[PDB]
Amino acid sequence: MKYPVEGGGNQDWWPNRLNLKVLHQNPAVADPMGAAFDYAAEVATIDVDALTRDIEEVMTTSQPWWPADYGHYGPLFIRMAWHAAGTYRIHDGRGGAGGGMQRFAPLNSWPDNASLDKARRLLWPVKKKYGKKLSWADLIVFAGNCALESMGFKTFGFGFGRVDQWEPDEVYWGKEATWLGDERYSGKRDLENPLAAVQMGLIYVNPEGPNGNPDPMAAAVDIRETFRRMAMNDVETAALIVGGHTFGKTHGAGPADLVGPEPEAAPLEQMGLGWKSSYGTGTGKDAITTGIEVVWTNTPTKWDNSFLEILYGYEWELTKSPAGAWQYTAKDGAGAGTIPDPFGGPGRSPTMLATDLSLRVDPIYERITRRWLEHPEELADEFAKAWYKLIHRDMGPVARYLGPLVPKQTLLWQDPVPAVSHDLVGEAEIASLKSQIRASGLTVSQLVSTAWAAASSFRGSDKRGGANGGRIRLQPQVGWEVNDPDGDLRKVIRTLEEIQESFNSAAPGNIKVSFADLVVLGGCAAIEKAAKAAGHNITVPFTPGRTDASQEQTDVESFAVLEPKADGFRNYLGKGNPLPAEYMLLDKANLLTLSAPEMTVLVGGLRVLGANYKRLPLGVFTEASESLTNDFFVNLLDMGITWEPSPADDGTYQGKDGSGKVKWTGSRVDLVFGSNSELRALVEVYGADDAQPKFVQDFVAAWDKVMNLDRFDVR
Amino acid sequence: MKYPVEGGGNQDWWPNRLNLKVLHQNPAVADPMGAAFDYAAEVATIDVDALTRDIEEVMTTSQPWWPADYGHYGPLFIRMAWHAAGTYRIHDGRGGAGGGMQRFAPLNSWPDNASLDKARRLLWPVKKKYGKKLSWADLIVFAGNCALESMGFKTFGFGFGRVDQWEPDEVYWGKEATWLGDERYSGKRDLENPLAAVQMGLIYVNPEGPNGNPDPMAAAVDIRETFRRMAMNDVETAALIVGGHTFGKTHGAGPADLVGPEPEAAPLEQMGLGWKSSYGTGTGKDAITTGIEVVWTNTPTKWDNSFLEILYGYEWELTKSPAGAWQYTAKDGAGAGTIPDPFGGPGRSPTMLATDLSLRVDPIYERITRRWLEHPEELADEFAKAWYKLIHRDMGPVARYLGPLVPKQTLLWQDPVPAVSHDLVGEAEIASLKSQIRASGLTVSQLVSTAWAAASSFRGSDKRGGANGGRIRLQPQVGWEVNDPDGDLRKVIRTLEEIQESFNSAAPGNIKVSFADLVVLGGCAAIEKAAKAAGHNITVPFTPGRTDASQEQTDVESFAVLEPKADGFRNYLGKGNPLPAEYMLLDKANLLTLSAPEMTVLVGGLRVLGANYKRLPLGVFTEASESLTNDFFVNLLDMGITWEPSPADDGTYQGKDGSGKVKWTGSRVDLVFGSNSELRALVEVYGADDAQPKFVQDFVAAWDKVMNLDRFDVR
Numbered sequence A, B: 001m002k003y004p005v006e007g008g009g010n011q012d013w014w015p016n017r018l019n020l021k022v023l024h025q026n027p028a029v030a031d032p033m034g035a036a037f038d039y040a041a042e043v044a045t046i047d048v049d050a051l052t053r054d055i056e057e058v059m060t061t062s063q064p065w066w067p068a069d070y071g072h073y074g075p076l077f078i079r080m081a082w083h084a085a086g087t088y089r090i091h092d093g094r095g096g097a098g099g100g101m102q103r104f105a106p107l108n109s110w111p112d113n114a115s116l117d118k119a120r121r122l123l124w125p126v127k128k129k130y131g132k133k134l135s136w137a138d139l140i141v142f143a144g145n146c147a148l149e150s151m152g153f154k155t156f157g158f159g160f161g162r163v164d165q166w167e168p169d170e171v172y173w174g175k176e177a178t179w180l181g182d183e184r185y186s187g188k189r190d191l192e193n194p195l196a197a198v199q200m201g202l203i204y205v206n207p208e209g210p211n212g213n214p215d216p217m218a219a220a221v222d223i224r225e226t227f228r229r230m231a232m233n234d235v236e237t238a239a240l241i242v243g244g245h246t247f248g249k250t251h252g253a254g255p256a257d258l259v260g261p262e263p264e265a266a267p268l269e270q271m272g273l274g275w276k277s278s279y280g281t282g283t284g285k286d287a288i289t290t291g292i293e294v295v296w297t298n299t300p301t302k303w304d305n306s307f308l309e310i311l312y313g314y315e316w317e318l319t320k321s322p323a324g325a326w327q328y329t330a331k332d333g334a335g336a337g338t339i340p341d342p343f344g345g346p347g348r349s350p351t352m353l354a355t356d357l358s359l360r361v362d363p364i365y366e367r368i369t370r371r372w373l374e375h376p377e378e379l380a381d382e383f384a385k386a387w388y389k390l391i392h393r394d395m396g397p398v399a400r401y402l403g404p405l406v407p408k409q410t411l412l413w414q415d416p417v418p419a420v421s422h423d424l425v426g427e428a429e430i431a432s433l434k435s436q437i438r439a440s441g442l443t444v445s446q447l448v449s450t451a452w453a454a455a456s457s458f459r460g461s462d463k464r465g466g467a468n469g470g471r472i473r474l475q476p477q478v479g480w481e482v483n484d485p486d487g488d489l490r491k492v493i494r495t496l497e498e499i500q501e502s503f504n505s506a507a508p509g510n511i512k513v514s515f516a517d518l519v520v521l522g523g524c525a526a527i528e529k530a531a532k533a534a535g536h537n538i539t540v541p542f543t544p545g546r547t548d549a550s551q552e553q554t555d556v557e558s559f560a561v562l563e564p565k566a567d568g569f570r571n572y573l574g575k576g577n578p579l580p581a582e583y584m585l586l587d588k589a590n591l592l593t594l595s596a597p598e599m600t601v602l603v604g605g606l607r608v609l610g611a612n613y614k615r616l617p618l619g620v621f622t623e624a625s626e627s628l629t630n631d632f633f634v635n636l637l638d639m640g641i642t643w644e645p646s647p648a649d650d651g652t653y654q655g656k657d658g659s660g661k662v663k664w665t666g667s668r669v670d671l672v673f674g675s676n677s678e679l680r681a682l683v684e685v686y687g688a689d690d691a692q693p694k695f696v697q698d699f700v701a702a703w704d705k706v707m708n709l710d711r712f713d714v715r
């Protein structure tokens, strides 16, 4: 239908096709910074106090195009930072403040991010001054932290180092083609995975209650669950909501139909700004943001215990803002004129949202907030800890936290590992340990499967998971179905520990090795052994420095989201995946941050290496096992094989030769590489006659890339 | 509505949004070969005789799964090769066999490319043997050439060098959301630019004549027009149809309703193959491809004059193929039994497509073909020329042609340039000529605008245009309205020619300089002088070797598609553009092979330098013109400036200050950078405090790229 410059593509002719562009997000060519750029280096040199001072100058310097409530943009900036982090979800670890995504589509034009577009525009003079040394990602969330401290709250600390990106993160936010649409519930109130919001374009919940019904008791069930799915428990949730509504006010001064198009749909001349309003001045006094007109506290620019003193201090009755939105006001005209107007007007009466009353009406939130009514210091403590978690949740290993405000305290949710407490294995020790692992009885399959089990639990979205920690032998990973607990895993683990014990006893100097490194090295040792069986002498690069975590450093509930329901690299398909196998493979490869070439060598390599879940013959197109050849590619391209969906319809295929006899069996994941015109192209590369040396080179680079995915401790 | 891995994204929310992904086509990460892969160097090592011998072995080895007509895949490959080359179009330069795009969507699944899927599959054995030394793109068309030569036609030559791409070139193929749909004609017949076919998914025209109506006279008008829009005049067109239809047959044995889904829509087990038919055996003698059943000649695996002897030897009556396709057969039962069956069956009568008859019904075609009836040697000669052109039209400069089979003869369609006659200007002479161009009194705008005019004539689609040839002083480029001929251009030519003489006829020595690189050098000296005005000492790098073409080496009607109806880099926008200015900018930058970073720095760079068409102040956001600064970027992010469309709605905007006076004017092209969320990110990089050296550094790398786009003579 359309020009490519305007969006036309192959997806238009075949709507449901495999979209391989998820394997080339943020390509170097789109990046203006050049290959040598390293943000971490830059921001480590930034003057934090100059930055803070300049932010605090922006916060108190009102701008005519969006005048500042109470002469302070602070509350506006805490909501910005809360919304930027607030998109995070646990199921896949996507969203979050990590990549500065609120500045792009569709997040920059979510209905719930209305007036954040001006909010980030106000911070331009800060970015202007600090340039390369300060990512918008870092600035957006830091501005909120500064807002907090500016207005009287001592934050627990802050980590710099979020890398700014240049095109939007393609995230599934839901199936609704309508803003604020809700097609995400089944059963009683079961919310569709991976989502962590109640409707499309909202951060968590409806400010007017479930589906717009201002029932605080019901709303609490939505707050409990969305926040759960953003890694927040009851105490953190409560802490955050009260902590947050302690500052600022909502905006709904006129009718919402008087508000223009969201930033993405808006006129060129609006310069990236959206929701331009025709009500009065359309800003400041006359500002419509949500359509709700609430000022929770008498001190909207100061941290105190006023929020709870009000919530519990008055009785609440349902009412309508000047835009027709549900909210609560204090009964019997009580508190008449106690709350101040943003722009000097007369005082107002106490107001709360339906969701604020959830904190008072829900049994659990009741016990928590009535406690902080009487003991306000516990609230600061819990908000401090929660806010730090909020804006850092998706920054992964603490190695990534940069700057003078990063505190020393280790947090369980950071999935911490011990510091390196001995000398690391040098070249001679690695070569020693490789030989030992090869002499241990463990097979190529066992070592490669265990190594892959451990490293491929990493996801690039929130940077959780991976081989570091040696968590493969801890719960839950030790009992994951894909890691095949009742399988060989425990034989492999016990063997690697004995070698760990052996080496660490006989070891020279003060060199000691971790189990975590040995798992990975066993993989590297096995890939060398296989390469030689195939007539190649290569060594597989290993990078030491993994440490072993204890069960107590490993939150079992938090690691549950990291369990694969599918792994196409092991020909594993569990139940409950949203899409057919091959779409789950691209997603798994996207999570491991792999290119299409890198995904392709790994599948083919791993199949002939025997990495398949339960050692199934699906996609093992080779006569020689324990041998790193390109056989998978050669055979998938063989036209002597006729492929047919299996008689016992089980998601598998039969490859029959000329005689009629089955030679090969395949999964959908296996066949997709002969079927997808773009994957076949990659298969014709590594399936050529000159191709086997290149296949081994590229497999090893890929495998190494995966083993090192969580290694921010050495980058 | 959908997951990103199923194609879901921001276009779903905002359908007509500027799609910047056109600027990162073929990302390096999706390429499995590696940054250091050099195809030129690979193909240099091939045994072309051994390749040919292997191709010949493929053509004569029938495969069970698609058996060979007359035991020879030659003609199928000729059609494959013809279809590969035959998507090209002059308006765009896009399409062609140059990228081996026929193996990817949407071209692999076009209705007209039916059974070509099988034809390419047949070549795997060759590609498998040769590996990286042979691209699919080269192999597809070379198989065609080999075919011709194996069946007794000596071809003019062949050049290797077509690099395989890894993702489909997304090209605008038409409005139609239906296959074979037609929504591309207005008026009597005027075809929609930039299209060069009469329906969606057709190479040129309907075999059954316009809209299935088998009027040979009318079909000829369509052949003329589509073939013209693919660079073929009447002789070439007639030579090609005749030459091709000397070989093979059409396939329409049974009903099209019994033929399956095309490759992109077909089940995994078919392994990238499509249109599987349930009619009979579904292959060979039962093969259905178009629905037409025509064998043109009596020696379908041999070159002779029998196509024309048959076309003129009989009288043709309208009939229907076994599939209800219009086609012609010899009246009066004549020529019964004379045409052989592809698989041993009995003889059959002569048959011709409606479009074949166009060749004796059309006055011009008729003159041309009736000549070749008695003068076959002139058909041989013209076909060889046309086929060569067909297979090479998108190769660009002759320097790109590789292998032992490239002929010596210069051809006018290759837009040739003289070889380098005498010695090249060295470092002393470069800086000497530099200083001398600055001391010319030609202004920074003049020098820069002229240098851009020349180099930005290039398009990386067919690799035509650019500053080699010094064609800016020749017709039609010196007349191009965007090159603003009624302005400075003549004076700039005069003055650079004057300096050319002065340098060449000054000091005896072996060194000579051309006007071609003097235009580029002058632009380069201007940009050195501009950067000095804003306090940077830089050497803009420059490579010599450009040579001057003559008017006689410049085909004025051929260069007419190379004319910009829009150049956003000069803020020019003519009439007749299909899309608004900002889209035409992204298309332009795509044809210049630019990245979004590169586009961005060049616009703002060229804005302040004075490169604007008619020197308009639109986007010239600077106080100090002819000085190289990041001003454009600083100023587009100034919030003190309010943008509104101009009262005289001329596509222009006004940027007023606090006082309400207009400080700036801009077009769509200018403000898109301050409006689009991804483009604003880039201008926020170049407009920050620390950016000026980086802007300049990047502007010059981007500039040296545009100047060098031509220069396959030196890489």
Ligand code: HEM
Pocket: A069, A075, A076, A078, A079, A082, A115, A204, A205, A206, A207, A223, A240, A241, A243, A244, A245, A247, A248, A249, A250, A251, A252, A288, A289, A290, A291, A292, A355
């Ligand atoms: C139960 C979940 C939550 C709901 C339903 C909710 C809802 C809202 C609404 C409707 C507004 C008014 C927006 C406007 O019209 O300007 C608002 C403002 C605000 N929110 Fe919340 N919010 C939630 C959680 C939080 C959290 C966790 C924080 C941060 C810790 C937070 C911080 C703020 C701040 C500082 C403002 C004031 C903005 C300004 O003054 O301009 N909220 N919230």
Ligand code: HEM
Pocket: B069, B075, B076, B078, B079, B082, B204, B205, B206, B207, B223, B240, B241, B243, B244, B245, B247, B248, B249, B250, B251, B252, B288, B289, B290, B291, B292, B353, B355, B387
């Ligand atoms: C207006 C121009 C043309 C029209 C309308 C046209 C139409 C057709 C059609 C309908 C077929 C049969 C496809 C099938 O059912 O298998 C065909 C086949 C063929 N074409 Fe053309 N064609 C044109 C030009 C050409 C050209 C320019 C060449 C190359 C010089 C060419 C070479 C061939 C060959 C070799 C076959 C036989 C394929 C085989 O034996 O499998 N054709 N053409």
